[PDB]
Write an enzyme that holds these catalytic residues in place. Structure first.
Site, PDB file in Angstrom:
ATOM      1  N   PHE A  13     -29.379 -66.483 103.597  1.00 13.68           N
ATOM      2  CA  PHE A  13     -27.924 -66.568 103.622  1.00 13.68           C
ATOM      3  C   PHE A  13     -27.491 -67.819 102.884  1.00 13.68           C
ATOM      4  CE2 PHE A  13     -23.877 -67.898 105.719  1.00 13.68           C
ATOM      5  CZ  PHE A  13     -23.096 -66.907 105.141  1.00 13.68           C
ATOM      6  N   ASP A  64     -31.141 -75.205 100.087  1.00 10.06           N
ATOM      7  CA  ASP A  64     -29.889 -75.037 100.806  1.00 10.06           C
ATOM      8  C   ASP A  64     -30.104 -75.603 102.196  1.00 10.06           C
ATOM      9  OD1 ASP A  64     -27.791 -74.145 102.382  1.00 10.06           O
ATOM     10  OD2 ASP A  64     -27.680 -72.177 101.414  1.00 10.06           O
ATOM     11  N   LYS A 114     -21.478 -77.352 106.651  1.00  4.32           N
ATOM     12  CA  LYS A 114     -21.494 -77.194 108.128  1.00  4.32           C
ATOM     13  C   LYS A 114     -21.311 -78.544 108.829  1.00  4.32           C
ATOM     14  CE  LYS A 114     -22.965 -72.480 108.936  1.00  4.32           C
ATOM     15  NZ  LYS A 114     -23.778 -71.634 108.064  1.00  4.32           N
TER      16      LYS A 114
END
Lengths: 391, 391
Positions: free
Chosen positions: A133, A218, A247
């Protein structure tokens, strides 16, 4: 009331999330309260975002101070918080080449920036992992390895090949002298906290280096000290060409970053990329406060210690529905012997705990790094009944 | 010092913006102060973002209150500020069909959501205007009509045709039964505050409706009441299928939105799109405060009045370097008889005014809606000397 809030949601929001089952009214630390007054221990952190929980005084003070000094200016003007934040992030990465920073607002935007850097290598072929993701905008969605979420929006930006995560020879076969970049999560979070085999990220570094491809890591979900090192890839002794963050970077305030090392840091030249809100003083001030608190309160080492005791505590239950616990630090997946994770998310909520069914058979935890040991203790003691009620 | 701040910038930031010539230290209202103590009247608002200037007490109060109540939760949970903000934005659009809202962090992400909605029509052809700006992520960059900023990142997501802005026949010829959507700015901002001919947006609405294409109006820069209606397209009495917002939406805090009307509002179903930070309580609280101040202080109608006074005052100068003034409300472009806008940006800066050379021959203004008429009057009185010095 929960029903009134849910009805208001259903009257005005797009249905891309479905309808949330609970409505939250307040939060403090790792405890949130819904509109009916029920409290829950937050073991998910808003999906790994609230690294310092809610109402952390250092983040509140930094935001309040900066709003009373200077707000948004755009990058037509240099401002202190973003420059200082970039300096601190480069220091934390600790690469032995020049590292440069681009700020944006989200993990998808950070990976879009990395996608664009990849184009400036002169190559257009990209490699990512099945079930990875990387975000939901059109570029980042091309990298995300989820056909059911991609097919409705095809065609997506090319040319991306997906390979099985953790498979050294599959990755080597897919990467050649036409490959601009390989994107990898150091632990696949959304898919179910999938940890790769021991040498895998080092193999990815060697494969990409030999073929002239960028390695993009990532760290949107694995970063911010959650695994016991500031960047999860630092456990593996490698230096990628590009790292993306978001995040938890702002402690809840929207901010993301793309860091590029060595030649990759020089690819973007004036006018080729930007983001209006990127690097703005208020969100940068929040992120600076998060970094200060991680360091002063030793929260990176604490995540490693608590994550290790939490994993052992869960495994010590000997529960027949638990196959194993995986992850690192305070990113953990409870892998089940049968697909009851969605039911366990609901019965955990009944017991006063917020968890995530990341896969039909995986419960994902990403608690605030400030979580109380006793709050974790209580969850472990409640877990057998949570799982028994789920089945 | 400015030199020290610029050196720090050049040591750590990627060079996608160049190096800012000004380092700002503080701001209050429409006046900002650089690190050397120089003050400037801000006629650009961080590129149309600071609708309420710096340190606006209503935004400070909303953000501080919400941070001390509940921060980020993710859209796994319903929270009041985003739901209320969606309700207020739907009320302001005033469509006669059901309207639904998706929140995100930026204008690029808002147009990425609209791009994805376009795909769910089953069509893949898109139409946008030459010189349009819709964002820099891979999907929004495909819609952006700026070849020099697109070609280095080719291939971009398909399949987009660009047509001359404001040309009804060209748009009618480009839109057919395979066209998913037409994206238009109601006034092209980045291009140089390019206003379309009377009737153009109404023609675009009729063309798209007849051909089954979505009309997407990008109000990221023209919205928030800047032109004297909340959405600039409301001046033309049309209702698009999709509207995107960002920039000023949060008064500086990062937030964007995609609003969809009628059948377009139902295209996104659960699991098909999302954004971790989207709709978070702190940024939504800021945006709610902006809407309250716009309403309570009548700033939308005030933007019309000030924009007319400003336009009339500039035209009344009769300066030979000014060809005409265009725009609406407080989005204004000064079109020059020769390409000296970048020089005029610098001489305006010498005189204590922040303006933008949007094109070689256009000076763009987008002041805070709280700008005093006296500050505008002072800029008009200074403009002859600014322009004389520019040439």
């Amino acid at each position: 009331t929960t029903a009134t809030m849910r009805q208001r949601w259903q009257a005005v929001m797009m249905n891309n999330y479905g309808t949330p089952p609970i409505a939250l009214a307040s939060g403090d630390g790792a405890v949130v309260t819904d509109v009916d007054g029920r409290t829950y221990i937050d073991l998910l952190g808003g999906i790994a975002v609230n690294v310092l929980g809610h109402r952390h005084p250092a983040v509140i003070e930094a935001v309040t101070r900066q709003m009373s000094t200077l707000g948004h200016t755009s990058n037509l003007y240099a401002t202190e918080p973003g420059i200082a934040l970039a300096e601190e992030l480069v220091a934390l990465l600790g690469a032995d080449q020049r590292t440069r920073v681009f700020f944006c607002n989200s993990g998808a935007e950070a990976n879009e920036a990395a996608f664009k850097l990849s184009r400036l290598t002169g190559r257009t072929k990209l490699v990512a992992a099945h079930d990875a993701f990387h975000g939901r905008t059109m570029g980042s969605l091309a990298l995300t390895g989820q056909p059911a979420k991609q097919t409705p929006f095809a065609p997506l930006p090319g040319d991306v090949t997906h390979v099985g995560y953790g498979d050294v020879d599959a990755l080597a076969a897919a990467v050649d002298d036409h490959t601009a970049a390989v994107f990898l999560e150091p632990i696949m979070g959304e898919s179910g906290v999938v940890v790769p085999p021991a040498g895998y990220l080092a193999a990815a570094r060697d494969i990409t280096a030999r073929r002239g491809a960028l390695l993009v890591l990532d760290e949107v979900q694995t970063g911010m000290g959650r695994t016991g090192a500031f960047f999860a890839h630092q456990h593996d002794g490698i230096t990628p060409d590009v790292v993306t963050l978001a995040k938890g970077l702002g402690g809840g305030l929207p901010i993301g970053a793309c860091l590029a090392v060595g030649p990759a840091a020089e690819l973007l030249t004036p006018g080729l990329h930007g983001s209006t809100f990127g690097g703005n003083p208020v969100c940068a001030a929040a992120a600076l406060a998060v970094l200060r608190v991680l360091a002063s309160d030793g929260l990176v080492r604490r995540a490693e210690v608590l994550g290790k005791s939490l994993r052992h505590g869960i495994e010590a239950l000997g529960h027949p529905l638990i196959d194993h616990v995986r992850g690192r630090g305070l990113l953990l997946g409870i892998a089940l012997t049968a697909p009851h994770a969605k039911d366990a998310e609901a019965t955990a909520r009944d017991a006063g705990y917020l968890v995530n069914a990341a896969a039909p058979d995986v419960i994902r935890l990403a608690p605030p790094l400030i979580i109380a040991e006793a709050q974790l203790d209580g969850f472990v003691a409640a877990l057998p009944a949570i799982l028994d009620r789920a089945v």
